Amino acid sequence: KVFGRCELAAAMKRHGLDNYRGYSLGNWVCAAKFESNFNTQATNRNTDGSTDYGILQINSRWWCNDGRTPGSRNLCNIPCSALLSSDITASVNCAKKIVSDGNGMNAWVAWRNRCKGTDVQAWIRGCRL
Numbered sequence: 671k672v673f674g675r676c677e678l679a680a681a682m683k684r685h686g687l688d689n690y691r692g693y694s695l696g697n698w699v700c701a702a703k704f705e706s707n708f709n710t711q712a713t714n715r716n717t718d719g720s721t722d723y724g725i726l727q728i729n730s731r732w733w734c735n736d737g738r739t740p741g742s743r744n745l746c747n748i749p750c751s752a753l754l755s756s757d758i759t760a761s762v763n764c765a766k767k768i769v770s771d772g773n774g775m776n777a778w779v780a781w782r783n784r785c786k787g788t789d790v791q792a793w794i795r796g797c798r799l
C-alpha cells in the first residue's frame with residue numbers, strides 16, 4: 671500500500687508514535703517519506719547482504735528474519751515479510767524497539783540526513799489528527 675502523507679500520520683498517531691521517546695509525529699512521517707516513499711512494499715538490499723523492509727526500511731541484520739541473512743539477529747521476533755503488510759502495526763511495534771535502543775532515530779540514516787534539524791512539523795501540516 672502507498673500511503674498518503676496525512677493518512678500515514680493518522681495511522682502512526684493511532685499506533686502511539688506521536689512523541690514516542692520524544693520524537694514528534696513529523697519526524698516519523700519524514701523518515702517514512704525518505705525511507706520508502708510511503709510504500710509498505712519497499713525493499714532494498716544492503717552491501718553486507720542484509721535487506722531493508724517496509725515503510726521504515728527495517729534491516730534484517732538485526733531486527734527481523736528473512737531466512738537469507740546469515741548470522742543475523744531477529745530482535746523484533748518477526749519474519750521480515752510481516753513488515754511489508756498494508757497494516758503498519760508490525761513495523762510500528764518494531765520501530766518502537768529500534769528507537770529505544772540507545773541511538774534514537776539516528777538508526778535511520780535518511781532521518782539523520784534529511785529530517786534531523788529541519789522543520790519536521792511541516793510533514794503533518796494540514797492533516798486532521
Ligand SMILES: [Cl-]
Pocket residue numbers: 694695696697790791792794
Ligand atoms: Cl511534528
Ligand SMILES: [Cl-]
Pocket residue numbers: 779780783784
Ligand atoms: Cl541519506
Ligand code: NA
Pocket residue numbers: 681756757758759
Ligand atoms: Na495501518
